Design a binder for this molecule. Structure first.
Ligand SMILES: CCCCCCCCCCCCCCCCCC(=O)OC[C@H](COP(=O)([O-])OCC(O)COP(=O)([O-])OC[C@@H](COC(=O)CCCCCCCCCCCCCCCCC)OC(=O)CCCCCCCCCCCCCCCCC)OC(=O)CCCCCCCCCCCCCCCCC
Ligand SMILES: CCCCCCCCCCCCCCCCCC(=O)OC[C@H](COP(=O)([O-])OCC[N+](C)(C)C)OC(=O)CCCCCCCCCCCCCCCCC
Lengths: 85, 78, 231, 161, 78, 78, 78, 78, 59, 59, 59, 59
């Protein structure tokens, strides 16, 4: 155990936490702000690049109908194999 | 009934098994040098070159033995 | 989760800036075979076969700054993680593979179907093609696994032996003044010999593993190179 | 102006058996024992021949695989199908064994073991051993040792029978 | 009766057994280099070409040991 | 009396035993390439054909290794 | 239920396994000397350079045997 | 719960395993003498120097055997 | 099981002996003596293992 | 299991016997005697293992 | 497991037989007889191993 | 596990067969027939091991 502990980075300085929802929402706000102006038509390749793949992924998530249960990505405890909740 | 048991002494057994891997490594190293002697007597002009390749093979063969020896230490010290 | 940390090369970066503000020749290279792919004259390749030189040299420099200096006690190999090495090898290997595939020359893969027309196509040749396609990815995985495991095992062994040497040196040196001094002297000499042997072995093995790491990539590249003859 | 090659005038060539051919059961080995461009035996059918090459002794019988043997100073035995043994002594050369059932033993010198004298051989060994003691340099000693090896082989060959 | 038992030191045994596979890999490597040394003395002019093939075998031989080494970790750390 | 016991940790032993099968595969590959080097020195003009056959032999041995790993992974998980 | 068990005599088992690692080491050493005799017999003038290499191979092979022996004695006293 | 168990029949098992290493030694002896005869036939003039080297190989191989044998007897009486 | 190597080791000696004798039949006596020597040395280890087996059998 | 190292050792002797016979076949009558001698020693080792296999199987 | 040594030993004998027969085909008859002799000996050891198996499986 | 000593023995026979065919390429038929004989005998040993394996498996 102790010898195994010698293989860690030795210059850790700071750790920051952020919820997926929050920064995803902020990114969406930024994307809307930059893609909103009239001088960027919806048919431009840039706008489609920005929007279409995200729309496709979200639609795929919504359409999903799985017989099994997928535990919440951001639980408080995900180390117990016998407690998905 | 649900019973959970934790045997401490098993780590010794796993450690001894890994040591068996050294039998192949130790034998493999001897194989290289045996060929080296039988090769130097067939072409002594290259003895220095052959000696270099033999040492290279020894390290590669030895490197594997260390992998097993690491696992021995991991279990012997946990 | 965002962790801010630093690599353990800052002093080495300072030394590089100090000693390489002026030009200097380079004549010794760990993997020289990336510069001489063709050995028979009049053979030339239309593919950018020399594209790997810069990456090879940079990788050698980076991994040598890390691994070789790791023999110094308390020096840290900041990149020593299985999946990080996987990402590195994935980048290099898959980049070259996609460079070959983007060429859109399907005939380039004809050699995957092993054997001749005599062999049964479905029951022999197709299985061999499956195995070789699997073996490419296995070669990538093996490269990264070998690079990880060599370092891990070498440093584990070094740490354990150093701990034992410290213990015996500190708590059993008084035997020099006792009647059993000869046993302690023999043990101390054996420990010194082992120390030297381990350090030499690790020094050699680091360079050798870098050589092999680069040679696997170069072999991937060479497996799909075709040479034309001058006329 | 083209000249004939000196092998065109030789009408007894070597017959090699094609690899893609059936096997034959042979009870006779065609031996050609030769010394200094002179055959002591010519395409002689024999039962077996024993030869002493560098690695060791070989007993060649009909059908023996293709091989080339570098002989050493030693006896050579030929046993006929009748049951008669003829013993020579050779100082060197080569033995070519063909899978077709032929054995061409070319020697620099091939003398019947009867001709050799053990008394002459014995006293020569004593003289050469004395010569080796007085040998000036390493080369001279090596040459003297070559003679002793042949002499001892001759002495041992005759003492055997 | 239904009895469920969980022995918590058994993964040591499995890890050691997988480590034993390294003996064959080490021996095979020694065999390759033994053949290399005895083969170079026969055809020295092609020394370099033989070396490349020798490394290829090592690459294709060390990889197998990694699978066994991989299983060791999957069981040693679980 | 009728007693039913279910040990959760016995799959580690089975996985380790299956991993031992790789020692034969590793040694077999070493034998293939050891002979390849010798053969190439003997008749270097046929290097490519010998290399092709050696790869074929390696593939078959690797296929057996895959079967062994399949059993190992199945027991490890199942 | 949580049950902790500590088996004493297991260290004897692990130590014996490490002893088996000396089988290959002993065999490997014998292989080197056997090859040495052939090389000497086929090249009698090199009776010292071959002897030195044989000693070098023995030392490396002895080292591997000593690595296992350290675990063999260590577990016996654990 | 903390349970301490002392099995008094497991000092036999470790002893038997330590004896297995003798096979790797005994076989090593035959290899040295297996090749000594060939060397003598190849170069009968060196029947003496080869014999001395073979004795050196046998003694060194036997040394490994006795190192293993020491562990065998220690666990038999302890 | 220790006898497995010992028995095999004997076969190796008596295997090479035939090759050595065939190559150099004039040295059968000297080769035969060395083969016996090797057999005795291997048998010594065989008795060592045999001694341990019997001790653990009647103990 | 010790029999594995005995039966295999026997095969090794005979395998070398064929080569020795196929090298110089006029010495077959001599080599065969030596081959039997080797089989007489390795087989004797197998008896010791067989003895233990019987003592423990009936005790 | 003892059959592993017996099976390998049998293969070893035949492996040498092919080399010996190719070297001197004229002696195939004599070599074949000796090869069978070796098999008759190695298989005999196998009988003991099987006998023990049948003497413990049915016990 | 006994099959391990069987498959290896079979590989040994064929490995020697190729060499024998290479040394004496006109004697392929006799070598091929003898190789088949060795395979049958070795396979018979494996079948005996399989017999015990199935007997215990269904017991
Ligand atoms: C809230 C708290 C604060 C933190 C906020 C953070 C916000 C985060 C947002 C979310 C981010 C999410 C994602 C994070 C992923 C992180 C991953 C990671 O860490 O990977 C490891 C990985 C480690 O890489 P590495 O191999 O160690 O090499 C990177 C090194 O930087 C070395 O690489 P290099 O050497 O190759 O780099 C080139 C180098 C080439 O070499 C140099 O240039 C040499 C200098 C090197 C400087 C950089 C090294 C820093 C060393 C440690 C700090 C130094 C001391 C600081 C003192 C602070 C005191 C409180 O040049 C530079 O670095 C250029 C900059 C030079 C600046 C010089 C300034 C001079 C000012 C002079 C003023 C004079 C005034 C006079 C007035 C007089 C009046 C009379 O990190 C990176 O690769 C970089 C990660 C950065 C991600 C972006 C983060 C967002 C930006 C944050 C800026 C905050 C500024 C405000 C701070 C105020 C004080 C509190
Ligand atoms: C190409 C091959 C290069 C070979 C280099 C060979 C170097 C030989 C060094 C001989 C011994 C030196 C002893 C130094 C002692 C320092 C003080 C001390 O206490 O150290 C103890 C330390 C550790 O000793 P320790 O383990 O006894 O420490 C005991 C301390 N306690 C009890 C607290 C744990 O010494 C070392 O770690 C020395 C190891 C050196 C290994 C070789 C490293 C080579 C790679 C780095 C080269 C860097 C070159 C950079 C050049 C510029 C590049 C641009």
């Amino acid at each position: 155990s102790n010898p195994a502990d010698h293989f860690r980075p030795n210059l850790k300085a700071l750790t920051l936490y952020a919820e997926r929802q929050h920064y995803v929402d902020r990114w969406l706000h930024v994307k809307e702000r930059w893609l909103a102006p009239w001088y960027l038509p919806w048919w431009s390749p840039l706008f489609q690049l920005g929007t279409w793949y995200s729309q496709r992924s979200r639609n795929l998530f919504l359409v999903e109908n799985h017989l099994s249960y997928r535990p919440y990505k951001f639980r408080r405890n995900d180390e117990d194999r016998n407690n998905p909740y | 009934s649900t019973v959970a048991i934790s045997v401490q002494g098993l780590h010794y057994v796993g450690t001894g098994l890994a040591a068996i891997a050294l039998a192949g490594v130790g034998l493999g190293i001897g194989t290289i040098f045996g060929n080296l002697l039988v090769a130097c007597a067939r072409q002594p002009n290259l003895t220095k070159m052959l000696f270099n390749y033999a040492i290279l093979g020894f390290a590669l063969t030895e490197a594997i033995g260390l992998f097993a020896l690491m696992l021995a230490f991991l279990m012997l010290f946990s | 989760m965002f962790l801010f940390f630093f690599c353990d090369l800052f002093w080495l970066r300072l030394l590089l800036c100090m000693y390489y503000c002026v030009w200097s020749r380079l004549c010794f290279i760990v993997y020289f075979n990336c510069l001489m792919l063709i050995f028979d004259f009049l053979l030339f390749c239309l593919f950018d076969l020399y594209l790997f030189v810069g990456l090879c040299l940079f990788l050698l420099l980076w991994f040598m700054l890390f691994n070789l200096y790791s023999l110094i006690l308390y020096y840290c190999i900041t990149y020593l993680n299985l999946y990080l090495l996987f990402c590195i090898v994935f980048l290099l290997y898959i980049a070259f593979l996609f460079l070959f595939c983007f060429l859109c020359d399907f005939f380039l893969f004809n050699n995957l179907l092993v054997g001749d027309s005599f062999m049964d196509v479905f029951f022999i040749r197709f299985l061999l093609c499956f195995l070789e396609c699997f073996s490419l990815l296995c070669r990538c995985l093996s490269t990264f696994l070998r690079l990880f495991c060599n370092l891990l095992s070498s440093h584990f062994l070094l740490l354990m032996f150093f701990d034992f040497f410290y213990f015996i040196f500190v708590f059993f040196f008084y035997g020099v003044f006792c009647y059993w001094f000869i046993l302690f002297i023999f043990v101390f000499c054996f420990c010194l010999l082992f120390y030297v042997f381990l350090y030499l072995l690790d020094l050699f093995a680091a360079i050798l593993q870098l050589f092999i790491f680069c040679n696997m990539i170069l072999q991937l590249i060479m497996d799909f190179l075709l040479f034309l003859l001058f006329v | 102006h083209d000249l004939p090659e000196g092998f065109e005038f030789m009408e007894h060539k070597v017959v090699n058996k094609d690899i893609h051919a059936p096997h034959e059961n042979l009870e006779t080995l065609r031996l050609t024992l030769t010394r200094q461009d002179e055959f002591l035996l010519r395409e002689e059918p024999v039962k077996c021949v024993t030869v002493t090459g560098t690695n060791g002794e070989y007993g060649i019988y009909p059908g023996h695989a293709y091989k080339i043997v570098q002989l050493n100073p030693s006896p050579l035995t030929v046993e006929y199908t009748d049951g008669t043994t003829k013993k020579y002594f050779v100082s060197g050369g080569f033995a070519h064994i063909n899978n077709e059932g032929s054995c061409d033993v070319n020697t620099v010198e091939c003398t019947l073991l009867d001709d050799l004298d053990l008394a002459i051989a014995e006293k020569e060994l004593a003289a050469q051993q004395a010569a080796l003691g007085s040998a000036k340099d390493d080369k001279a000693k090596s040459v003297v040792e070559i003679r002793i090896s042949v002499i001892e082989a001759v002495i041992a060959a005759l003492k055997h029978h």
